[PDB]
Amino acid sequence: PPTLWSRVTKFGSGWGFWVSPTVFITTTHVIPTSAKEFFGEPLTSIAIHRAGEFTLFRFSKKIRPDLTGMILEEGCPEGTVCSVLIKRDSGELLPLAVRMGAIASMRIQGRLVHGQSGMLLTGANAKGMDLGTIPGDCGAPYVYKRANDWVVCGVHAAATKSGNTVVCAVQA
Amino acid sequence: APPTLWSRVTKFGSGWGFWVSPTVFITTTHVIPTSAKEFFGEPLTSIAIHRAGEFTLFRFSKKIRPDLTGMILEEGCPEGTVCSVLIKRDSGELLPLAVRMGAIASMRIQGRLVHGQSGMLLTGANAKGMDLGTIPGDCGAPYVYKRANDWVVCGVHAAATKSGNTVVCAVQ
Numbered sequence: 001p002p003t004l005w006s007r008v009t010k011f012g013s014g015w016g017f018w019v020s021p022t023v024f025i026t027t028t029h030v031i032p033t034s035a036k037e038f039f040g041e042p043l044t045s046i047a048i049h050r051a052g053e054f055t056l057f058r059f060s061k062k063i064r065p066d067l068t069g070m071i072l073e074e075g076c077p078e079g080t081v082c083s084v085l086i087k088r089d090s091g092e093l094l095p096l097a098v099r100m101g102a103i104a105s106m107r108i109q110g111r112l113v114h115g116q117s118g119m120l121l122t123g124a125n126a127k128g129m130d131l132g133t134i135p136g137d138c139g140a141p142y143v144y145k146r147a148n149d150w151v152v153c154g155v156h157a158a159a160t161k162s163g164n165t166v167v168c169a170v171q172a
Numbered sequence: 173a174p175p176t177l178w179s180r181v182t183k184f185g186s187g188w189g190f191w192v193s194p195t196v197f198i199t200t201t202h203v204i205p206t207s208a209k210e211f212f213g214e215p216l217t218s219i220a221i222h223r224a225g226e227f228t229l230f231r232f233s234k235k236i237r238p239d240l241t242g243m244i245l246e247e248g249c250p251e252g253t254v255c256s257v258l259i260k261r262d263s264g265e266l267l268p269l270a271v272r273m274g275a276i277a278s279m280r281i282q283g284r285l286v287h288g289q290s291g292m293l294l295t296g297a298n299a300k301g302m303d304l305g306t307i308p309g310d311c312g313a314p315y316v317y318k319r320a321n322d323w324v325v326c327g328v329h330a331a332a333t334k335s336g337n338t339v340v341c342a343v344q
């Protein structure tokens with residue numbers, strides 16, 4: 001089968017995720033502000049649903065017919081351990097464990113972001129090791145396994161200078 | 173993880189091995205082909221084999237990899253150290269899996285008695301399978317970490333539990 005990783009796609013100034021052959025999710029601030037098409041489809045062909053830092057695209061034709069439809073939910077229960085599926089331009093894949101907390105407005109580097117808080121579980125200083133997020137990672141999905149089902153519950157919106165604290169933007 | 177460390181990760185037998193220096197190659201004992209009499213064009217005659225359980229070191233009498241500098245190999249790492257397992261996957265994808273290392277352990281894993289340094293993946297809550305965890309083809313991948321200005325190698329991938337959450341590093 002197609003891996004979860006084949007769904008994570010370079011987009012704008014960051015990334016997005018294919019939920020199904022017709023549905024693509026991303027972080028609002030990475031989307032280009034000058035465009036007549038995305039993925040070769042005209043904008044008149046695309047339904048755009050924006051809710052703060054969460055955006056969903058629905059295409060009128062099958063862009064990724066190789067995929068099956070996944071479960072998309074509005075965040076997850078408090079204490080759920082998600083994986084943020086980070087791709088880097090080196091060709092590195094960095095799945096990082098994050099403990100999910102409450103939906104809130106949080107001050108992240110002097111700016112207000114609304115979404116689900118999370119705390120990285122990869123430990124202290126991460127030195128120069130592949131253990132934390134960087135600005136170019138915005139749009140990377142949050143996913144977890146529930147019985148036999150993969151669930152996607154939002155997209156990477158922001159992170160503190162420190163690391164430890166991240167914000168997952170959610171569907172509303 | 174730095175390009176020089178990925179350059180050292182070599183497809184080998186049923187898994188991988190790792191160039192510590194131009195003359196020193198390490199791997200997991202069970203991936204070595206049992207009838208093999210030649211390695212990198214050299215006869216066994218010309219090679220010093222140092223086997224401790226699932227850890228094997230090959231010392232060559234000629235420089236096989238003169239493009240590399242020699243780096244530090246240690247006998248496992250402190251309890252609590254976060255390492256990266258340098259895993260190569262289908263088509264130049266690079267998966268530096270984060271792991272929290274624990275005690276030296278003896279385990280039974282499916283049909284085998286295994287001895288080495290235990291650790292727990294920091295990729296997700298249920299890391300069973302190829303997206304967030306290890307697969308049997310990953311045996312021999314190096315365990316590395318950053319200390320001050322240096323990177324260290326401290327073992328090679330030997331096993332994972334049925335659940336996938338626990339891994340075992342074979343150590344010198």
Ligand SMILES: CCc1nnc(N)s1
Nearest residue numbers: 079080081099121297
């Ligand atoms: C489930 C992972 C957790 N880390 N800290 C806790 N108290 S729960």
